[PDB]
Every structure is written in structure tokens, then in C-alpha cells.
Ligand binder design. Structure first.
Ligand code: HEM
Ligand code: HEM
Ligand code: HEM
Ligand code: HEM
Lengths: 146, 141, 141, 146
């Protein structure tokens, strides 16, 4: 993505304060709670019967760490997301059968999680920068769909 | 909000579909898979090739549901209750996809009903498919 | 469809907003103009600079409307009737834009309600905003 | 856009049979009928109250011809849609204040009109080629928005 130098530093600076594993579990759990149809891929995870069950499920938390860890690594390649996520795009399409709309939902849930975590430090301009990143990653993951 | 003229327009257009409803349903699906490839993610278990009997079979199921909706245009929520439960709780198709199929159904109708696809009828059909879509996704959350 | 628990969650969260409803309303608009610049197309007549009285006043009118809807959550259609007509017949804002403001209103609430913004409340607020959006666009065609 | 040689030929072959004047007027009139909020940009055009009023309005027909004519030009520069539409992108944003979502609606109404006009010749593969083109054009026109 095309972020101004200012935008890149705002992203990087907040990210440095993130507990990846924690936010990962929170974002994934909140996606499954707020948009329940997303639970369709996770029937092997066990009990997703209530918000509490979802947020507390160790399988959800483990998957959230895996997803955000990859996300986290992509922040180093802001300039080459398509390339960085190409293989994962292919995997998500050909083997996993994940509708790319799920990537967009996760990106909005991630922005709400950061807002909740950071409060006032998540200013309108810092949000805008993260919006570009989350759209960029969603696009990069949807790129190889066919 | 389907006005009496919208209802009239839909019953008329659907009337003319008649017996071809199943062939039009299959064609709509084919247009959808080709134009919006992300929709293929919900049918990993189907042969999506042109002429596929699985697509033809599914097309008839979809068209029949629409026929039932037209017949019960005043009581759609009850008529499609079982299909709303199905989509919300088992299939779990992202709501965004309903707009893509609706578009493809419109294109199919256009291509087959030259005379009947007037601007007024096109508007009524779009409103009707949006109503069906709303009903189908009403129990998602 | 809003469950009774949804209604309870909204009332509880909105209650906490309280007196800051207008200030939050203004921040949500600013977050929307910055994140989704295409929404600025509907405000060419406004000074959209940070802290403008036009944005502050509009923010207040938006919050008041949401307050009215929480108050009358069981009959939104009637409650927002006037607003529903204005948006359908005068403003004519494309329906996509309602989802972008809803997202920015959720982010604003998250940033200000650390205690209350649990997963269940987040779900209920999302659904509430979607219902308000549906009522506001219900007379478009 | 990236069109296979077969998509490019499908696109080009059908477009040689299009009467731009006529299809332009039909497409713009159907947009105003089907998604009436779009009339907000055409207050000075006269009577737009009924479908018949919309469809026989000469200002609608004229504008429709201008728009499709410009659309025809991009068909000649399929490899550089953004460069082709840059000036028009800035015009629509800065002077006209048109929400780019309107470009997407028009793209879909156009598809409907070609199917209505061409019938059975507007096959599933042809449509798919057109859908990539109208998305491309919509994106090219929203590119300079800020
Ligand atoms: C930022 C967006 C995302 C990123 C970076 C991402 C990344 C990953 C990675 C790194 C893996 C493991 C690949 C491997 O097994 O080598 C994975 C697997 C998977 N992802 Fe994605 N993912 C994202 C979004 C999503 C979403 C939104 C869903 C569904 C709602 C999803 C569903 C899955 C599933 C079902 C698997 C397989 C898990 C398993 O087999 O244990 N992903 N993803
Ligand atoms: C107008 C909108 C729709 C209608 C009326 C409709 C109707 C139906 C019907 C009647 C069935 C068969 C249920 C059964 O097996 O008894 C079904 C199943 C299914 N639908 Fe929907 N549907 C609609 C939209 C969608 C969309 C947009 C998608 C995804 C792109 C979708 C994906 C499916 C799938 C995957 C199945 C199960 C197929 C199978 O395994 O046989 N549906 N639908
Ligand atoms: C939750 C959704 C919304 C609510 C509750 C809402 C509510 C309102 C209210 C209360 C007014 C003022 C009416 C008056 O002054 O009499 C208004 C006007 C307006 N709204 Fe909406 N609105 C919403 C969404 C939107 C969106 C998404 C946009 C465009 C992106 C928008 C654009 C406008 C505009 C341009 C005006 C007129 C501004 C002026 O000239 O003062 N609204 N809205
Ligand atoms: C295919 C996409 C489109 C293309 C290529 C296009 C192209 C054009 C062109 C060539 C002009 C003439 C500029 C001039 O000489 O003043 C124009 C003007 C205009 N367009 Fe677009 N247009 C497109 C879509 C739209 C849509 C969807 C809308 C709104 C629904 C729209 C609203 C307008 C308006 C309001 C004007 C000014 C008419 C006047 O001068 O009163 N356009 N456009």
C-alpha cells in the first residue's frame, strides 16, 4: 500500500504496543460472535455456543494467534503485500474455500479491537491509516481467487 | 416495500418465465460463478462445468423457491422460513452474495424476456429480489 | 432482528454515552471523512475542518436521532419516519454509506467505553446500527 | 484490466454492434428508474417523475450518449483505464461531487441493457468479460477521489 511516511510510522508505532497473541484471540473471537456465519469454518473447534464459550475456546485463541502473527509479519512488507500473501491467497481459495468477504469483516473487527484497546490514542488519522492497511491485506489475500 | 404495481409486475414477469424457471435458475448460477468467482467458494463439492447436472439441479431448487415467493408475495417470511433457517444456521452464506445472484437473475431475465423487461418491470424485479434476499438473511444473527 | 437482550445491551451502552452523545457523533463523522473520503461527496457545502461548528452541530443532530431510536427501539419505523422521508426524498444518500458511518460510530463507542464494549454489546450495537440504517433507507424506492 | 485474449475479443466483437447513442440513453434512463436516488445529480434535467418521463427525456438521452461515448474511449485503452480516466475522475470528484458507488450501479445497469438488447448472444462468458470491464472503469473513475 501507498501510505505516506507519516502514516507508516503511526501504524508501526501503535503496533509496537500490541500483544499479538492477545489481540489475535480477541479479534477472532469477536468476528465469530458479531458475525456468526463466520463460524462455518470452525465446527471442529468445539463449543461456540455463547459469547463466553467463543472468547474462551482455546482453539479460537490458537487460530487467532496464527492469523494475527501472519498479519503482523505483513506489516513489515507494506510495500509488497500482494507478493507477501500470494501463497496464502492461493491456499484460502483452493483448499480452504474462504469467501474473501470474511477478510473484510475481520479487518473491521480488528480496527474496533484496536480502538477498544488504545482508547484515545487510536485517533481519527491513526484509524484512517489502519483502514488502508486492513483493506490492503484483504485485497492481497483475495488476489489469487479464481 | 412492494407496491401493488410492483406485485403486479413481478407476477406478470414470473408468469412468462413459466416452465423455463429451472433453466433460467441454472443459467443465473452459471453467470454468477463466471462473473463473481468468489461465489464458487460455497460449492467446493459441485462440478461447476458448463452443463453440470448439479448446477442444473440446484438451479431448479432456486427457481422453485422464487416461484413459491411470488405465490406468497404477501407472506414471504413464513413461506421461506425453512430456507431462512437453512441459510442462517447451516449454509451460512455471507449476505453480500445474495446481491450477486440477484444481479445474475436480472441479467438472465433480461436476456430471455425482451418485451417484458421494461424499465418499470426491471425496477419491480430488483425490489422483489432484494426483498427475497432480506428474508433469506433475516435470521443470521 | 433485535432480540430483547440486544435491546437491553443498546440501552445500557447508550445510557453510558449519555451527555457525550453529541461529541461522539461529531468524532464518528470526522473518523468517516478521514477513513472513507468518498463520503465527503455528500458534504461539499460544509467546512469539514477539524472542530468546525457545522460538523459539531451535525454530530449532535445525528446523536439525538440515535437517542430517539434507542428510546423507541420497539417502534423505530414510526420514530424515524421523518428522517426516513428526508433521506429517501431529499438527501438521497446511497445506502452503502450507512455501513461506513455505522462502522465509525462503533469505533468511536469502542474508543470511549472501555468497560462496556464487550463482545456481546459490540454484537448488539452492530445489529442496532444496521436496523437504524435499514429504517433510514426503507423509503428509497 | 487483465482480460484473456478470449475475453478481449468477446468485448470488442459485441461493442462493434452497439449503437452508443441508443444504449447510452437506455442505460442512464434505467439507472434513474431502478435507483431513483441517483436523480439527485440531475435536478435540472426536467421531468423524471415516471419511467416514461425518464425514458423519453431528451436531456437524459443526450447525457447517456456523452457518458457511453466516454466509456467507448476506455474500451480502446483497456490496458490503461486509470490513465485514460484521470481527468474525468478529478472532475467527478472535485466539481461534480458524485459518489463513486454510482459508477458501480451504472456498470450493472449497462450489463442488464446489453443482455436485454443482445439476448442469447450475451452469453455467460461474454457477461463475465463485461463485468471485469465495468468494474475496471468504475475503479478508474474513483481513483482520483480524495
Ligand atoms: C488477516 C487475514 C488472515 C490471515 C493473515 C490469515 C492467515 C492464515 C494462516 C497463516 C493460516 C495457516 C496456513 C497454514 O496452515 O500454513 C490460516 C489458516 C486458516 N484460515 Fe486464514 N487468515 C486470515 C483470515 C481468515 C479468516 C477471516 C478466516 C475465516 C473466517 C480464515 C480461515 C482459515 C482457516 C479455516 C484456516 C485453516 C486452519 C487449520 O487448518 O487449522 N482465515 N490463515
Ligand atoms: C435468491 C437467493 C437464494 C435462494 C432462493 C436460494 C435457495 C436455495 C434452495 C431452495 C436450496 C436447496 C435447499 C435444500 O437442499 O433443500 C439452497 C441451497 C444452497 N444454497 Fe441457497 N439460495 C439463494 C441464494 C444463495 C446464494 C447467493 C448462495 C451462495 C453463493 C447460496 C448457496 C447455497 C448452497 C451452497 C446450498 C446447498 C447446495 C447443496 O449442497 O445442494 N444460496 N438454496
Ligand atoms: C445512522 C445513520 C444516520 C442518521 C441517524 C442520520 C441522521 C440525520 C439527521 C438527524 C440529519 C439532520 C436533519 C435536519 O437537520 O432536519 C441528517 C441530515 C443529513 N444527513 Fe443523515 N444520518 C445518517 C446517515 C447519513 C449518511 C451515511 C450520510 C452521508 C454519508 C448522511 C448525510 C446527510 C446529509 C448530507 C444531511 C444534511 C446536512 C445539512 O445540510 O445539514 N446521513 N441526517
Ligand atoms: C461510465 C461512467 C461515466 C463516465 C465515463 C462519465 C463521463 C462523463 C462525461 C464525459 C461528462 C461530460 C463532462 C462535461 O463536458 O461537462 C460527464 C458529466 C457528468 N456526469 Fe459522468 N460519467 C459516468 C458516470 C456517471 C454517473 C453514474 C453519474 C451519476 C449518476 C454521473 C454524473 C454526471 C453529471 C451530473 C455530469 C454533469 C452533467 C452536466 O453538465 O449537467 N456520471 N460524465
Amino acid at each position: 500500500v501507498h501510505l505516506t511516511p507519516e502514516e507508516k510510522s503511526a501504524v508501526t508505532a501503535l503496533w509496537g504496543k500490541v500483544n499479538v497473541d492477545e489481540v489475535g484471540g480477541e479479534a477472532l473471537g469477536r468476528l465469530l460472535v458479531v458475525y456468526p456465519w463466520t463460524q462455518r469454518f470452525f465446527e471442529s473447534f468445539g463449543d461456540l455456543s455463547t459469547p463466553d464459550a467463543v472468547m474462551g475456546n482455546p482453539k479460537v485463541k490458537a487460530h487467532g494467534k496464527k492469523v494475527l502473527g501472519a498479519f503482523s509479519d505483513g506489516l513489515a512488507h507494506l510495500d509488497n503485500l500482494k507478493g507477501t500473501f500470494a501463497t496464502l491467497s492461493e491456499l484460502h481459495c483452493d483448499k480452504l474455500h474462504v469467501d474473501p468477504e470474511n477478510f473484510r469483516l475481520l479487518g473491521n473487527v480488528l480496527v474496533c479491537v484496536l480502538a477498544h484497546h488504545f482508547g484515545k490514542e487510536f485517533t481519527p488519522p491513526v484509524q484512517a491509516a489502519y483502514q488502508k492497511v486492513v483493506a490492503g491485506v484483504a485485497n492481497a489475500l483475495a488476489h489469487k481467487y479464481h | 416495500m412492494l407496491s401493488p404495481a410492483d406485485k403486479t409486475n413481478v407476477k406478470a414477469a414470473w408468469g412468462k418465465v413459466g416452465a423455463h424457471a429451472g433453466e433460467y435458475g441454472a443459467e443465473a448460477l452459471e453467470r454468477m460463478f463466471l462473473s463473481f468467482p468468489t461465489t464458487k467458494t460455497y460449492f467446493p463439492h459441485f462440478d461447476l462445468s458448463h452443463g453440470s447436472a448439479q448446477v442444473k439441479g440446484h438451479g431448479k431448487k432456486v427457481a422453485d423457491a422464487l416461484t413459491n415467493a411470488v405465490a406468497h408475495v404477501d407472506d414471504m417470511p413464513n413461506a421461506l422460513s425453512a430456507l431462512s433457517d437453512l441459510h442462517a444456521h447451516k449454509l451460512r452464506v455471507d449476505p453480500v452474495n445474495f446481491k450477486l445472484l440477484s444481479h445474475c437473475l436480472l441479467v438472465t431475465l433480461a436476456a430471455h424476456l425482451p418485451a417484458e423487461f421494461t424499465p418499470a418491470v426491471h425496477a419491480s424485479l430488483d425490489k422483489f429480489l432484494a426483498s427475497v434476499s432480506t428474508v433469506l438473511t433475516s435470521k443470521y444473527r
